[PDB]
From a paper:
The [name] AcrAB-TolC drug efflux pump contains the inner membrane H+/drug antiporter [name] comprising three functionally interdependent protomers, cycling consecutively through the loose (L), tight (T) and open (O) state during cooperative catalysis. [name] is the homotrimeric IM proton-motive force-driven H+/drug antiporter component which recognizes and actively transports multiple drugs (antibiotics, detergents, dyes, and solvents) via the tightly connected AcrA and TolC channels across the OM, leading to an observable resistance phenotype. Four different entry channels (CH1–CH4) have been described with putative entrances from the periplasm or the outer leaflet of the IM toward the two drug-binding pockets, the access pocket (AP) and deep binding pocket (DBP) inside the [name] pump. Here, we present 13 X-ray structures of [name] in intermediate states of the transport cycle.
Structural analysis of trimeric [name]-Phe563Ala reveals a rather unexpected TTT conformation and the c-loop with Leu674 appears to block the tunnel. Indeed, cells harbouring Phe563Ala are growth-compromised in presence of phenicols, β-lactams, fusidic acid (FUA), and novobiocin. Since β-lactams and FUA have been shown to be transported via CH4 as well, we realized that the c-loop may play an important role in drug transport not only via CH1 but also via CH4. We therefore compromised the entrances to both CH1 and CH4 (Phe380Ala_Phe563Ala), and observed indeed a strong sensitivity towards FUA, β-lactams, and the failure to grow on DDM by cells harbouring this variant, whereas wild-type activity is retained towards doxorubicin and rhodamine 6 G (R6G), presumably transported by the unaffected CH318.
Numbering used by the authors:
A (entry chain B): 11 to 166
B (entry chain A): 1 to 1040
C (entry chain A): 674 to 817
D (entry chain A): 50 to 145
E (entry chain A): 866 to 913
The structure:
C-alpha cells in the first residue's frame, strides 16, 4: 500500500513515459499490483505503451507477473495485437506457454483474434501448438471454429 | 389629461386607489419564486435494468429509445448516460419558449412506440418521462432518533405513507424518493439449492405459481341456469402478504416424501428494491423526498403547505420518526424579498428627507411619498397581466427602476415649486403652466425609455429569459409612472402645495434652512457662470469628451463578464470520488470523515450533513458520493470567515491529507437549474463507428494538447468516469450442449443470482410491492463464488459454472455517454486568467481538427447558448439606438437636436466601469441593466434641459446662449435632488455583506458610480452638446 | 354534478389496517351519527356490504404428488368458471373476440367443482376434489 | 373477465394508482374495483383545467403502467376518457 | 363548499369598495356616494 506504487499504476495506464521515468528514479515499486493483480507492465501491454514496457523491464519488472485469474503481460499483448510489445516481452524471457486459470495461453488469445504475425513469433519462441485450455481446445481448433483458413494452415 | 384631473382631485385619487388595490391584490395572489423559467425546457427519459452493466443498458435500451427520438419540434440537442448501476437517463433539451407540456407529450409518444422493443425487465421497472428543467424547492429528510429503523425501514414508510400525500399538497410538482418502498427479498443459498437439485429458475417458477392472484369466476355466474338461488364470487389463490407465507412455498416433494420449502434454500426478509444508494443525516440512517415546484406555483405557500401537512401526520408517525429539512430555498427567498422591500421603503424615506432639504415643507414632501408606492403596487398588477412572478429578477428590476419612478415625482413637484416662487401664480394655476412645459416631454421620454429597455427582451436563450424579466418590469413601472405623473401628481400639486411669494427662495428663513437656501442660490449662480464660460470655448471640452469615450472603451474591454454573482444560500455541496473498483464500505468511511469534520471543525456554522453514498455529478456507482451541508441561519454566521466561500476553501484544503480519495467542497451557482455557468462545455463525438476505446485515445490526445496551452486553457478535464476492471465470463456453448445444460438456465442462474431478478408483485399491509430473488451477499462477492453455483442438465445431474465457463479481467466503461444519438465524451474547462471564453472555445476547435478521422465535436450547455446569442447582440443595440433617435426627432421636430441628448450615454457608463473595476466586480446582467437605468435617467435629464432650451428659443424667441443657460439653471435643482435621493437609495446595497448581498453589490456599485459621473458631467456637457449641435446643424436662424 | 343536497364524506385507512377494520370504524361512525338525529339525517354508506364468497384452496403438495401442474389447475378453474378471451375471429368481415367458458349447468354450485378434471404428467385425469378444499368466507363485491 | 373485487384492486387498480403522480391541477382521485371484474379510476381536476391536457397527462402515466397489468386486462383495452361531460341522449334499439 | 368559503366575504368587500370609488369619482365627493349605497337593503327586504 505505497502511494508511489499507486501513482506508477495510474501513470503506466495513461501512457505518461516521462512520469514513469521520474517515479522509477524516486524508487517506486515496479511490481506494484492492482486489486485484480495487474502491474504497470500488465497495463502498458494492454493499452499498448511500448516505451513504458521497455522502461519497466530495464528497471527489473517481473515479465511473468500474473493477475488473480492467472493472466500475464504476454497474454494481453498477444490478445490485442501489440506485436512490438510481444517481441520485447519474449526477448526479456516471457513464459511463451504461460497458462491462465482457464488453461488459456498467449497462442490461444492471438489465434482467437487472428493475429497471424504474433502467432508466428510465439511459435518461433517455442509456443506449444498442442496446448489445450480447460475445454480441450487448441489454437488450431479456435482457428477452425472462427473459419480462419490462413491461420489454420500455419498450425498444421 | 393633467388639467382635467387638476379640476377633479377625487377622480385622480379614485384611479390611484384602484391601481393600489389591483397591485395589493396581485401581490397576494402572484406566484413567488427564487427565479422564473431561465434554463431551456428539458425532458428526461429514465429507465433501469436491474443487474445490467453500462454497455447492456446502452445497446438494449438507450440506442433503441434514441433511434426513435425524431419528428419532435424545437429540439436543440439530446444527451444520454448509461451506467454500471443499470440506469439510463436520456435528456432532450428544447428551445427557450417551447411549451414544456407539448415537449413532454411528443417525447412520451415517441418512447411509447419503442416500449415493445425494450427488454421486459426494463418495461416492468417503468420508463418515466418527466420535465427535468425544473429545480428542487426543498429536500424533506426522514430519520428515526430511536435507532430502531434501518435505511430500508424508513424508506418504506416514506414511499408508502408520505410520497403521495406530499404530491397532493398545494403547488407541488415532481417528487423523487431517497431509496425505495419494501421489496420481498428471497436471498438464495447455492449450497442448499444444489443439495435438492434446484436452481434460481425453479425458485422463480415456484414464486410465480404459488404467489399468484387467480380470477376464478362466480357461483351462479352469467349466463346462469333458471332457478339459480346463489350468486357468489369464487376466491382462489391470493398474493402472499408475509415472509412466513413466502417461506412455505413448496419447491418440490422428494422421493422419500419429505418437502423442500423456499425457506430451506433461501433467507426471506422485507428489504429495498435496490441497495446501490446509502443515505445518512448527521451519521444516522435516513430516507427523504426531493420536492419540485409546479408551473406558476407560490414557493412560499408550497413550502408552508408541506411543513403544515407533514405536522398533520406527526401523530400518525411510528415512535422516533422525525422530519428534517437538509435543503430548503424558502428561507433565502423570504430574505431576498424582505431585503428588496427594505430597499424600496428606505428609498421612499430618503426621497422624503431630500424633498424636505430643498423645498422645506411637509405638504410638498408627501406627493412623491404617495405617487412612488402607487406605481410600485400598480407594476405588480401589470406583471400579473403578463403572467410574471415575484422573483429576484423582477424584484431588483423595481429597485433599479426606483430612480426613474422617483424622478417622475420630483420633476413634477419641483417644477411647480419653481414656477410659484419665480412667477407668484397660485398652486392650481402654477401646476397648469408647470405641467404644460413637461407633459409633452414625459410622453416622449416614455417612448425613448421603451426603445432602451424593450429590445432587451428579444434576446434568445436563457440570458434573454433573465433580461426579459428586467425589460418588462422596468418598462411597465416606467409606463405607469408617466400615467400617474399626468393624473395624480398634477392633482395633488394643485390641492396640497401652499403658495410661495414671487422672488422668495427661502433665503429670508433663519437657522440651517436659511444657510442652505443662501448657499445653494450662490452655488446655482456659480454653476451658470461656470457653464457660461464653458460655452465660450466648446472646442476644448469636445476633446475631453473624446478622452472619456476612449477611457470608457478601454475599461469596458478590461472588465471581465460573469453570468450572475455567487450567493451564500445556507447550503453547499461536497463531492466524493474514490478510485476505480472502490466499494460502498470504503466510500462510506470517507463520507463519515467528511460528515465528522463539518459537525466538529465547523460546529458553529453547520446544522446538518446529508451524506449520499453511490451518486456523483461525474457519474454514479459505489466509488462516488455527495454531502448536502445545511448551514445555520445567516444571523448565527457573522463575518466573511463564516460565509459559504470561506467554509468551502477551509474544507477543500482540510481534504488534502485524505486517504487516496478526491474530495472537493464548492458553493452552488446563483441559478442551480443552469449549473456552473463559468467556463465552457465541449462534446467529443465518434462519427465513424470507431468505438469507445478509440474515442478515449482521441479524448486523451485532445486533453494533452489542452495542457500544452496553460496560457489560454485551464482545468480542461472529462466530465465522465474512466474505464474500470470488469470480470468478463465466457460460456462454452459446446460444453453446455455436451452436458445437456440449457443456455437459458445458465444466463437466468447467473443473472438472478449475481444481478437479482424482479419476479412478480405481492401485498404488504394492503399495498402492492415487488418480489426480488438474488444470491445472499456471501455467495456473490468474488470470482471463486462462481463455482458454488450449479445448473441442472436435461439428464437431471447438477453441473457447476466452472464446467462450462472461463473468466478473465478486461477494462470497460461504468458510464457510457452519447450526444445526438452518437457515442460522446463531455469535456469541461475554462479560459485562463485574462483570456475570454470565446478565445478558449476558438483554440479547442483548432485542437479538435488535429484529432483522428471519424472524430467530430459539438458545443452544448452554456457554450451552445453563447455561440447562438452572439450575432443578435449588436443588432438589438442598433435597433434601440435608431428608435431612440426617431423618438427624440419626433419630440423636438428635428433630425439634428436628438444628437444633443444621445451624446450623454458615455457620461454614466464611465462611472459604473470605474466603480466596478475599482471594487473588482464583473460585467454581469445586474451591472448591464444598471447602465441602461443610469443611461435612461441621464438621457431624461438631457431631454428636459434641451426641451426647456428649445421651448424658450421657440415660445419666447430667446437666443441660443440665453435659452441654454436659462434651461440648466431651472433643471439643476431637480437633477441634483433625484441624483442624491437615488445615490443614497443604493448605498446600503454597496455595503451589504448579508444574505443576497452578491446581487445587491452588483446592482448598487455600478449605479452609484454611474449616477455620480452622469450627474456631475451631464450638467456641464448637455448644454455644450445643444450649443455645438444647434450651431453646426441650422440654416440662417439666429444666435440672438 | 349529482344530488348537490347534503354532504360527501370519505373514511380512509391510513395505517394498513385492512378492509374488515375500516368497516368496523365505518359502523362505529354511523352509530354515533344515529345518536344525533337533531343535527345529522340519513348518514349512510354509498358502497355495497360484504357478501358470502366461495373460497377454494389448492393443496400444492397433493397437486405435485399427483403430478398435476398448478398452471393447468388455475387455467381450468379460471377459463371454465370465469371465462377466457383466447383470440379474435372474422364474423361477416368484422374482427370480434373468441371466448371459452363452461356451459351454464356445469358452473352453478360448489358440487360442480368435482365435475372438472385436470390431466397429470402421467396422463391420468385428476378431479378438483382430489387437490382442493372450499369454505364460505365474507369479502367485498365493491372495494373503494 | 372472471376476476373478483380484490383481484382487480391488487393486480390493476393499485398498480395504475401508484403511477398517478406528476399530473398538474389534480384535486383528488377515487376508484371502484367490483365483483364483475371492472375498475374505474376517476381523477377530478381544478375548475378551468384544460381537459385535453388533463386526459393526455393521465394517459401518458397509465401508458407506463400498462406492461405491469395482467395480459388479460391489456387485451380488453384500458380506456382513458373525459367523464365530466353529460349524456345528450340515449338511443334505444329493439326488435318488435 | 369547504374551498369556496374564505373568498365569499372578500369578493363582497372588493365589490363594495369599487362601487364607492366609482360613485366618488362621478359626484367628486367622499361623502355623497353613501347616499346611493344606503339603498341596497330596500330591495333585499322584499326579495327575502
Ligand atoms: C409601498 C412599496 C411597495 C412594497 C411592496 C413590495 C412587495 C414585494 C413582496 C411581496 C411578497 C408578499 O407575498 C406574500 O409573502 C408571504 C410571506 O412574507 C407569503 O406567506 C407565507 O409566509 C407566511 C409567513 O408569515 C406564512 O404565514 C404563510 O402561510 C405563507 O404562505 C405569501 O404566500 C405571499 O403572498
Ligand atoms: C471665457 C473664459 C473663461 C473660461 C473658464 C470658465 C470656467 C470653467 C470652469 C470649469
Amino acid at each position: 500500500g505505497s502511494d508511489l506504487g499507486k501513482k506508477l499504476l495510474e501513470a503506466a495506464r495513461a501512457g505518461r513515459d516521462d512520469e514513469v521515468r521520474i517515479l522509477m528514479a524516486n524508487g517506486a515499486d515496479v511490481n506494484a499490483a492492482d486489486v485484480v493483480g495487474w502491474t504497470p507492465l500488465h497495463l502498458a501491454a494492454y493499452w499498448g505503451h511500448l516505451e513504458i514496457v521497455e522502461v519497466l523491464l530495464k528497471n527489473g519488472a517481473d515479465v511473468n507477473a500474473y493477475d488473480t485469474l492467472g493472466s500475464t503481460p504476454l497474454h494481453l499483448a498477444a490478445h490485442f495485437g501489440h506485436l512490438e510489445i510481444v517481441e520485447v516481452l519474449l526477448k526479456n524471457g516471457a513464459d511463451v506457454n504461460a497458462k491462465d486459470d482457464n488453461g488459456i495461453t498467449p497462442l490461444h488469445l492471438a489465434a482467437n483474434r487472428g493475429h497471424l504475425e504474433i502467432v508466428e513469433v510465439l511459435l518461433k519462441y517455442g509456443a506449444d501448438v498442442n496446448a489445450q485450455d480447460k475445454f480441450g481446445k487448441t489454437a488450431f481448433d479456435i482457428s477452425i471454429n472462427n473459419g480462419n483458413e490462413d491461420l489454420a494452415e500455419i498450425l498444421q | 389629461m393633467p388639467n382635467f384631473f387638476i379640476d377633479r382631485p377625487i377622480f385622480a385619487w379614485v384611479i390611484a386607489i384602484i391601481i393600489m388595490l389591483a397591485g395589493g391584490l396581485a401581490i397576494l395572489k402572484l406566484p413567488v419564486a427564487q427565479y422564473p423559467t431561465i434554463a431551456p425546457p428539458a425532458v428526461t427519459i429514465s429507465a433501469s435494468y436491474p443487474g445490467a452493466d453500462a454497455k447492456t443498458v446502452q445497446d438494449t435500451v438507450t440506442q433503441v429509445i434514441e433511434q426513435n427520438m425524431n419528428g419532435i419540434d424545437n429540439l436543440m440537442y439530446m444527451s444520454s448516460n448509461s451506467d454500471s448501476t443499470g440506469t439510463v437517463q436520456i435528456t432532450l433539451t428544447f428551445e427557450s419558449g417551447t411549451d414544456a407540456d407539448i415537449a413532454q407529450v411528443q417525447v412520451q409518444n415517441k418512447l411509447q412506440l419503442a416500449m415493445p422493443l425494450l427488454p421486459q425487465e426494463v418495461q416492468q421497472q417503468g420508463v418515466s418521462v418527466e420535465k427535468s428543467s425544473s429545480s428542487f424547492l426543498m429536500v424533506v429528510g426522514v430519520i428515526n432518533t430511536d435507532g430502531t429503523m434501518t435505511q430500508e425501514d424508513i424508506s418504506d414508510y416514506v414511499a408508502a405513507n408520505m410520497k403521495d400525500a406530499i404530491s397532493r399538497t398545494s403547488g407541488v410538482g415532481d417528487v423523487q424518493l431517497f431509496g425505495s418502498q419494501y421489496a420481498m427479498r428471497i436471498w438464495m443459498n447455492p449450497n442448499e439449492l444444489n443439495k435438492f437439485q434446484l436452481t434460481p429458475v425453479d425458485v422463480i417458477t415456484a414464486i410465480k405459481a404459488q404467489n399468484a392472484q387467480v380470477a376464478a369466476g362466480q357461483l351462479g355466474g352469467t349466463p346462469p341456469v333458471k332457478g339459480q338461488q346463489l350468486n357468489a364470487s369464487i376466491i382462489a389463490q391470493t398474493r402472499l402478504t408475509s415472509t412466513e407465507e413466502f417461506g412455505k412455498i413448496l419447491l418440490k416433494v422428494n422421493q422419500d416424501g419429505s418437502r423442500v420449502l423456499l425457506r430451506d434454500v433461501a433467507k426471506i426478509e422485507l428489504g429495498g428494491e435496490n441497495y446501490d444508494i446509502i443515505a445518512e443525516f448527521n451519521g444516522q440512517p435516513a430516507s427523504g423526498l426531493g420536492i419540485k415546484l409546479a408551473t406558476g406555483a407560490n414557493a412560499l405557500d408550497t413550502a408552508a403547505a408541506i411543513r403544515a401537512e407533514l405536522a398533520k401526520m406527526e401523530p400518525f408517525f411510528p415512535s422516533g420518526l422525525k422530519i428534517v429539512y437538509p435543503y430548503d430555498t424558502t428561507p433565502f427567498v423570504k430574505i431576498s424579498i424582505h431585503e428588496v422591500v427594505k430597499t424600496l421603503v428606505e428609498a421612499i424615506i430618503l426621497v422624503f428627507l431630500v424633498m424636505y432639504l430643498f423645498l422645506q415643507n411637509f405638504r410638498a414632501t408627501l406627493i412623491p411619498t404617495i405617487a412612488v408606492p402607487v406605481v410600485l403596487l400598480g407594476t405588480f398588477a401589470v406583471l400579473a397581466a403578463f403572467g410574471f412572478s415575484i422573483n429576484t429578477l423582477t424584484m431588483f428590476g423595481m429597485v433599479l427602476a426606483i430612480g426613474l419612478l422617483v424622478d417622475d415625482a420630483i420633476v413634477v413637484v419641483e417644477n411647480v415649486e419653481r414656477v410659484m416662487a419665480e412667477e407668484g401664480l397660485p398652486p392650481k394655476e402654477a401646476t397648469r403652466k408647470s405641467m404644460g412645459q413637461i407633459q409633452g416631454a414625459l410622453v416622449g421620454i416614455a417612448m425613448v425609455l421603451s426603445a432602451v429597455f424593450v429590445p432587451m427582451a428579444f434576446f434568445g436563450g436563457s440570458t434573454g429569459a433573465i433580461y426579459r424579466q428586467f425589460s418588462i418590469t422596468i418598462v411597465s413601472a416606467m409606463a405607469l409612472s408617466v400615467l400617474v405623473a399626468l393624473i395624480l401628481t398634477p392633482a395633488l400639486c394643485a390641492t396640497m402645495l401652499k403658495p410661495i411669494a414671487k422672488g422668495d427662495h427661502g433665503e429670508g428663513k433663519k437657522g440651517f434652512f436659511g444657510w442652505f437656501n443662501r448657499m445653494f442660490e450662490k452655488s446655482t449662480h456659480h454653476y451658470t457662470d461656470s457653464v457660461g464660460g464653458i460655452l465660450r470655448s466648446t472646442g476644448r471640452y469636445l476633446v475631453l469628451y473624446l478622452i472619456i469615450v476612449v477611457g470608457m472603451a478601454y475599461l469596458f474591454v478590461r472588465l471581465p463578464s460573469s453570468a450572475l454573482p455567487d450567493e451564500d444560500q445556507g447550503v453547499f455541496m461536497t463531492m466524493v470520488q474514490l478510485p476505480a473498483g472502490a466499494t460502498q464500505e470504503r466510500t462510506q468511511k470517507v463520507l463519515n470523515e467528511v460528515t465528522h469534520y463539518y459537525l466538529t471543525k465547523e460546529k458553529n456554522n453547520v446544522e446538518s450533513v446529508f451524506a449520499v453514498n453511490g451518486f456523483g455529478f461525474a457519474g454514479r456507482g459505489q466509488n462516488t458520493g455527495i454531502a448536502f451541508v445545511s448551514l445555520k441561519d445567516w444571523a448565527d454566521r457573522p463575518g466573511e470567515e463564516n460565509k459559504v466561500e470561506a467554509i468551502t476553501m477551509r474544507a477543500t484544503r482540510a481534504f488534502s491529507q485524505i486517504k487516496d480519495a478526491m474530495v472537493f467542497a464548492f458553493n452552488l451557482p446563483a441559478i442551480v437549474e443552469l449549473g456552473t455557468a463559468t467556463g465552457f462545455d465541449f462534446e467529443l463525438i465518434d462519427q465513424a463507428g470507431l468505438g469507445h476505446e478509440k474515442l478515449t485515445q482521441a479524448r486523451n490526445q485532445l486533453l494533452a494538447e489542452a495542457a500544452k496551452h496553460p496560457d489560454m486553457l485551464t482545468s480542461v478535464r472529462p466530465n465522465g468516469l474512466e474505464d474500470t476492471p470488469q470480470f468478463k465470463i465466457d460460456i462454452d456453448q459446446e460444453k453446455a450442449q455436451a452436458l445437456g445444460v440449457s443456455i437459458n438456465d445458465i444466463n437466468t442462474t447467473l443473472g438472478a443470482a449475481w444481478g437479482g431478478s424482479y419476479v412478480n408483485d405481492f401485498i404488504d399491509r394492503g399495498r402492492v410491492k415487488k418480489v426480488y430473488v438474488m444470491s445472499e451477499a456471501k455467495y456473490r462477492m468474488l470470482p471463486d463464488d462462481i463455482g458454488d453455483w450449479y445448473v441442472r442438465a436435461a439428464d437431471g445431474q447438477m453441473v457447476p459454472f466452472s464446467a462450462f465457463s472461463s473468466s478473465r479481467w478486461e477494462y470497460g466503461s461504468p458510464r457510457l455517454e452519447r450526444y445526438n444519438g452518437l457515442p460522446s465524451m463531455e469535456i469541461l474547462g475554462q479560459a485562463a486568467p485574462g483570456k475570454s471564453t470565446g478565445e478558449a472555445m476558438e483554440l479547442m476547435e483548432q485542437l479538435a481538427s488535429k484529432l483522428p478521422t471519424g472524430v467530430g465535436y459539438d458545443w452544448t450547455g452554456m457554450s451552445y447558448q453563447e455561440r447562438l446569442s452572439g450575432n443578435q447582440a449588436p443588432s438589438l443595440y442598433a435597433i434601440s439606438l435608431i428608435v431612440v433617435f426617431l423618438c427624440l426627432a419626433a419630440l423636438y421636430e428635428s433630425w439634428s437636436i436628438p444628437f444633443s441628448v444621445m451624446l450623454v450615454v458615455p457620461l454614466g457608463v464611465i462611472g459604473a466601469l470605474l466603480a466596478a473595476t475599482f471594487r473588482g466586480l464583473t460585467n454581469d446582467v445586474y451591472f448591464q441593466v444598471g447602465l441602461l437605468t443610469t443611461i435612461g435617467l441621464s438621457a431624461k435629464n438631457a431631454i428636459l434641459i434641451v426641451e426647456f432650451a428649445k421651448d424658450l428659443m421657440d415660445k419666447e424667441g430667446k437666443g441660443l446662449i440665453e435659452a441654454t443657460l436659462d434651461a440648466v439653471r431651472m433643471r439643476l435643482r431637480p437633477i441634483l435632488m433625484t441624483s442624491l435621493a437615488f445615490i443614497l437609495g443604493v448605498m446600503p446595497l454597496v455595503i451589504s455583506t448579508g444574505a443576497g448581498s452578491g446581487a445587491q453589490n452588483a446592482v448598487g456599485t455600478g449605479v452609484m458610480g454611474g449616477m455620480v459621473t452622469a450627474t456631475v458631467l451631464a450638467i456641464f456637457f448637455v448644454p455644450v452638446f445643444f450649443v455645438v449641435v444647434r450651431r453646426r446643424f441650422s440654416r440662417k436662424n439666429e444666435d440672438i
